[PDB]
């Protein structure tokens, strides 16, 4: 990886555009106000460690960048002297200070999350060079936030239909490995989901957490044996029952998920599980349920009909809240068409039909890890303060046609209000000490990571109020 | 990277689930029934992740240790992975056949097939589904970028009478707006199949390493301002910022974001009056490109053109459309996706503005606002051999006929009328439809056929270009 080639092309030309005698450029990241009222701050530590810390500049990396940019711009605009200064003066360590809110912190929209400034006047251009790399923090923030918003929905309906939150942390499983844009995205997004939940098939998340964050536990996430269409259909259309019997016999003493919609989900539930193989299900341990997996049709209609079928073939109980409960050897996972909108529709539809949320778990792939943009929380990096000719200037944009794109002015700090909420103070007003100490911590300075969070601390920070 | 840790967790358990006496699992990828897709990106995945010695003793032990904790159970196929290590020096006993990269193929056609070449590794075909299915992303970026090229080509031809500058009309602004550094490189490279303009530098190194071009680089950019380089001058000094930037870049094209405070003021009073002398003096090879970046994308473009048309000498081209002087152009780089791009060029045509006047920048719309569901990219088992007998295999869910999968051994053919057909159930072997367009690209740990980026661009050309 070469940080000289890890920026938007136009940033190569910016050192020539700032006012002459600029010694400081100070910038900040926020999830701008435009429901998603609060965001989980997660993922900066990965970026600091993988891309920004240590000797990130070499003679070879400067020459490679110079040669690429000569052809890319058909011109010599690359700041070879600027990058040589960092190599010679700081042994290729970035003279940058980053201050950040602690990872896992849940912060309302429109608040400073991190700030970036140069620590050497010669490197005024370096602050916004690394905008592109740092702004990619939008992705883990947005995955972690969207995953937590789904946990809030599941927690509300599980508490209402069961009276407790038992099994909440296994109710939204990451199915998204095949449905993301790259191996690197898979690791980052799966790790962001595991801030809120413990169930993942995106194995890439485990190694990222272990290398960059750390857990007391051997692994941060768990899975179970499960079928796919290929392991059912390989037996032939007329032998679906033989596939089912083989798979539940192979996994007789652990939980096993079996996709049941290869030909006819309703037939599979009522005739194959419900009659032909019923003797192999009712014998199973509470620690080894069969989880029936529909994977096609209208998500709500399919879940309700599957539960109606299973409710007639298996002994249903009524829990202490008056909701119906399958026997403990039998559960359902809906792994198709799940996003934050359909998840809400399904748990509401189950509640209206008196089915406990105890009965169901969700799998989400594209909806969880891919169907998200930087526009969802309006993640944005802007210059708010410069020093030119030794004089500090509060700087901002304020486009006439979009007040939502107005940026904050001057040196920023994050504070608790007297009522215990968050406020971002602008124009250096944090210095007045009317709001106590700045909640941002220096996490990066002059090529070193200076403060860091375990994955266990991030999980505690990101807990729901209902969990607390 | 450890390929034993690069699958969906459940695939770790599938070797126990296949019918006993299964010697072959044969699987295919299609974009299930955006009427045609650009096949691009498989060669990246083959080289980066699948080729050479991908299994070691250390990688087997590491997978075993992770899976023991992940499943709280010993289900990992240590024996199967150790067999590949000892028998084949850790080279995957897999054969992949693929349509050539850059080929534009209608929906619902086989694009590549995967099968095991050793009966012991029946389980390996679908192990690598997860890695291979990520080809959805470069296919979808390349396809969506090409569909935007079709819209731009149509309106440029109608309003100008030619396609000059088409290849610079959709610029990649997406580096900050994608999920990772790796996604940036793959997505940017997929866009460059169709266009030559990118700020996503990561695409250049990917193309050089995995595909190659005759030209030094596949993609180009221009000096351009950002809000930081304008706003740093202070609110009262926007004119000083513009003057400094166009003077620093007097001899090359320069893009200047003009909406920091008031885009309409900047166009009419700063560019249009105060600094007009620095603009009308510029070369045809060194235009000012004014960049709005806020408000309604269509309304803002139309009002910016109306303003510039009243301050600068406009001509009428041979098609009757209004053309700014050659030293002055516009780039709309905010809120651009395939839907709004169409709205903007249609709105310009109705107001008699040539598409010659404008280029588009697209970030999230181009590289991030896409899913595997857009072209229904999907990998399914179509054929197995069990007890030495070949069986046609498929799914056909009662509640969704759109998820019905193809049966048996597949081949891709030209029809008599020059279209495409996928033959099922091994009917390619009858040879009624000429040569299979699938070629072996990977066999037993070796990439057997490669394409240059130059070949891929040729294959993905528009009809209007031909
Ligand atoms: C990938 O497929 C999945 C994933 C998660 C679930 C939810 N699970 C399994 C939970 C456990 C882990 C290892 C996933 C943890 C708690 O107790 C156990 C039952 C012993 C195992 C369920 O039992 C379930 C499904 C629907 C409602 O409840 C079901 C299927
Ligand atoms: C990133 O900002 C951009 C990118 C591309 C454009 C389009 N360009 C510049 C094209 C060239 C660049 C991309 C190397 C190639 C052709 O010849 C030149 C005019 C000399 C230069 C334009 O001139 C333009 C904008 C709107 C309509 O036309 C404009 C702004
Ligand atoms: N474990 C599963 O059922 C699963 C995993 C990934 C994608 N689809 C389903
Ligand atoms: N060159 C540009 O104007 C640009 C690049 C990346 C993102 N936004 C704008
Ligand atoms: Cl599946
Ligand atoms: Cl080895
Ligand atoms: Cl910008």
PDB file of C-alpha atoms and ligand atoms in Angstrom, chain A residues 173-179 200-202 223-229 257-259 293 295 333 335-336 363-365, chain B residues 7-11 13-14 71 129-130 372, ligand 3:
ATOM      1  CA  UNK A 173     -27.030 -13.021  11.678  1.00  0.00           C
ATOM      2  CA  UNK A 174     -24.548 -11.607   9.102  1.00  0.00           C
ATOM      3  CA  UNK A 175     -25.182 -13.378   5.728  1.00  0.00           C
ATOM      4  CA  UNK A 176     -23.395 -10.594   3.750  1.00  0.00           C
ATOM      5  CA  UNK A 177     -19.951 -12.064   2.785  1.00  0.00           C
ATOM      6  CA  UNK A 178     -20.879 -12.816  -0.907  1.00  0.00           C
ATOM      7  CA  UNK A 179     -22.984  -9.623  -1.199  1.00  0.00           C
ATOM      8  CA  UNK A 200     -21.900 -14.056  11.783  1.00  0.00           C
ATOM      9  CA  UNK A 201     -21.085 -16.209   8.722  1.00  0.00           C
ATOM     10  CA  UNK A 202     -18.709 -13.429   7.504  1.00  0.00           C
ATOM     11  CA  UNK A 223     -22.173 -19.711  13.837  1.00  0.00           C
ATOM     12  CA  UNK A 224     -23.948 -23.096  13.465  1.00  0.00           C
ATOM     13  CA  UNK A 225     -23.990 -25.826  10.815  1.00  0.00           C
ATOM     14  CA  UNK A 226     -26.466 -24.929   8.048  1.00  0.00           C
ATOM     15  CA  UNK A 227     -27.462 -26.253   4.582  1.00  0.00           C
ATOM     16  CA  UNK A 228     -27.443 -24.328   1.277  1.00  0.00           C
ATOM     17  CA  UNK A 229     -29.466 -25.064  -1.900  1.00  0.00           C
ATOM     18  CA  UNK A 257     -30.244 -24.664  10.018  1.00  0.00           C
ATOM     19  CA  UNK A 258     -31.856 -26.338   6.947  1.00  0.00           C
ATOM     20  CA  UNK A 259     -32.989 -24.255   3.949  1.00  0.00           C
ATOM     21  CA  UNK A 293     -34.962 -21.571   6.894  1.00  0.00           C
ATOM     22  CA  UNK A 295     -35.467 -18.210   1.568  1.00  0.00           C
ATOM     23  CA  UNK A 333     -34.614 -18.179  10.575  1.00  0.00           C
ATOM     24  CA  UNK A 335     -32.631 -15.059   5.738  1.00  0.00           C
ATOM     25  CA  UNK A 336     -34.155 -13.512   2.548  1.00  0.00           C
ATOM     26  CA  UNK A 363     -30.229 -13.413   8.465  1.00  0.00           C
ATOM     27  CA  UNK A 364     -29.327 -10.261   6.486  1.00  0.00           C
ATOM     28  CA  UNK A 365     -26.658  -9.989   3.747  1.00  0.00           C
TER      29      UNK A 365
ATOM     30  CA  UNK B   7     -15.882 -18.492   2.949  1.00  0.00           C
ATOM     31  CA  UNK B   8     -19.336 -18.205   4.569  1.00  0.00           C
ATOM     32  CA  UNK B   9     -19.078 -20.100   7.918  1.00  0.00           C
ATOM     33  CA  UNK B  10     -21.813 -22.626   6.925  1.00  0.00           C
ATOM     34  CA  UNK B  11     -19.723 -23.807   3.874  1.00  0.00           C
ATOM     35  CA  UNK B  13     -20.029 -27.861   7.247  1.00  0.00           C
ATOM     36  CA  UNK B  14     -21.197 -28.704   3.662  1.00  0.00           C
ATOM     37  CA  UNK B  71     -18.723 -23.396  16.022  1.00  0.00           C
ATOM     38  CA  UNK B 129     -18.674 -19.568  -4.148  1.00  0.00           C
ATOM     39  CA  UNK B 130     -18.340 -16.670  -1.625  1.00  0.00           C
ATOM     40  CA  UNK B 372     -25.876  -7.999  -5.859  1.00  0.00           C
TER      41      UNK B 372
HETATM   42  N1  LIG C   3     -25.660 -19.773   7.212  1.00  0.00           N
HETATM   43  C1  LIG C   3     -26.580 -19.441   6.257  1.00  0.00           C
HETATM   44  O1  LIG C   3     -27.721 -19.933   6.266  1.00  0.00           O
HETATM   45  C2  LIG C   3     -26.217 -18.470   5.157  1.00  0.00           C
HETATM   46  C3  LIG C   3     -24.982 -17.834   5.127  1.00  0.00           C
HETATM   47  C4  LIG C   3     -24.679 -16.934   4.089  1.00  0.00           C
HETATM   48  C5  LIG C   3     -25.634 -16.679   3.121  1.00  0.00           C
HETATM   49  N2  LIG C   3     -26.797 -17.318   3.138  1.00  0.00           N
HETATM   50  C6  LIG C   3     -27.125 -18.164   4.135  1.00  0.00           C
END
